Amino acid sequence: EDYLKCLYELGTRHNKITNKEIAQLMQVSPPAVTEMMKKLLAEELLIKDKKAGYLLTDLGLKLVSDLYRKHRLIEVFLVHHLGYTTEEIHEEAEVLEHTVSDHFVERLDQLLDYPKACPHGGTIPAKGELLVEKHKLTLEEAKEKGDYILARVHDNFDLLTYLERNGLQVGKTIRFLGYDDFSHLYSLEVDGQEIQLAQPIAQQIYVEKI
C-alpha cells in the first residue's frame, strides 16, 4: 500500500509508468510489482492507462489524499508546536504518523484550528476530500524572469537540507535570473546574491510571480 504514495508523486510530472521505476524507487524486486498492481486493480484502487501507464482511481486519490492530510497536520504540530527542526522531523515524523489514529488526526485538526498549509507550502485536504495543491508552478515550469515568491518545496529531507544549507525558505522572496539553455542551470538572486540550481532541484520548488 505504501506503493500508492509513489504513484501519486510521479503522477505530478506526467511521465509514464515503468515496472522498472517501481522496483527502483521503492527498493523491492519486480516479483512484488506484478502482485502489488494486481491487488490494486481488483480493489478498484487504480486502472491501467496505455498513455500514462497507471492512473489512480478516485478511491485511490481519496486514499492517498488522506495520507497527505495525516502527514501534513503532524508536520504543523511538530514544527509549530513542539519546535521540531527539519532534522528532528527526519527522525520521528513518519513513525507516529503511521501510528496515530484518524481520531487523533481529526482532533489535531481542531486544536490547530484547521490550518490550510504545512510549513513547506503543502496543502491540507479536508477529511475525505481530494488533494489539490494551491501552489503548482515549479521553477522549471516558470517561463518569465523577475521577482517570485518561494511558495512550496517538496517535503524531502535531502532537499530541505539542500535548500536551508543554501538559504531558501518557503516564504522568502526570490528573483529569477533565467535558465541557461546549455548550462542546464537556473539562476536566482536571493538576498542580493547568486545561486545555481540543477534541474532535479528546480523541479521540486514551486514559486509565484507577484
Add this chain to the structure above:
Amino acid sequence: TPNKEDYLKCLYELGTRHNKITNKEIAQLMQVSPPAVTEMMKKLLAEELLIKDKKAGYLLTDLGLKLVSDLYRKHRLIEVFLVHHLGYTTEEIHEEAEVLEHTVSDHFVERLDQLLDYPKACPHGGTIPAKGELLVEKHKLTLEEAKEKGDYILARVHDNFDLLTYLERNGLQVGKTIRFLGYDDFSHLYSLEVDGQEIQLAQPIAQQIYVEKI
C-alpha cells in the same frame, strides 16, 4: 507485547504494598508464562534495574527508579495532552494511549512537556516528575488507610480503565468532595457521601482511591 518497562511499572507498584514479590504474583499481574517471568527478571537483574532482596523480593536501583520515572512522565504527559488538548474520553484514551506510549520518543515527551506548560499532575491526580527527578506522589493517603471520619477531597485515583468506568458510573471524580463515614468493622465496607447520596465501596476499591482530609 509486555516490554521491560511494563514489568518495572508493575514491580514498582507491586511494592507500594510493601510485601514480598512472588513471581507467581508477577505472573499474575502481567498475565504471562512463568518461564517468561524468569526470563524477564534475568534481564532486569542484568540491566541493574533491580536486585534480589530477602524481605522485599526485589528492590529497585537508582537506575530502576529513574526509568520508572520516565515511564510515568511519558504516560501522564500523554494523558494530559490527550484529554486537555484533544478532548479525549476515558474510552478513547483506553483505546489509544498505550500505543502512543510505546511509540513516541523521549524527545517528543520533552517537547510535549513544554507545550503543556510543565503540568505537575495529570487529570487523575497522579503527580508528574521532572525529567530525571524521582517519582514522589503528591497524594499517598488511600481511602482504606484513612483514619478520621468526615469531609475529604478525592485527590487521586489509579489510572485503571475498569476503575475509572466504575467511578464515572458512581459519579466519583477527582476533585469532588467526599464524606467518609468510616469502615464498618464487619460489613467490610466503606461508606461515602458523594453528592449527598450514600454509596458503599469494597476494600479492593477503597485501596485504589486517594484522599486528603479537608
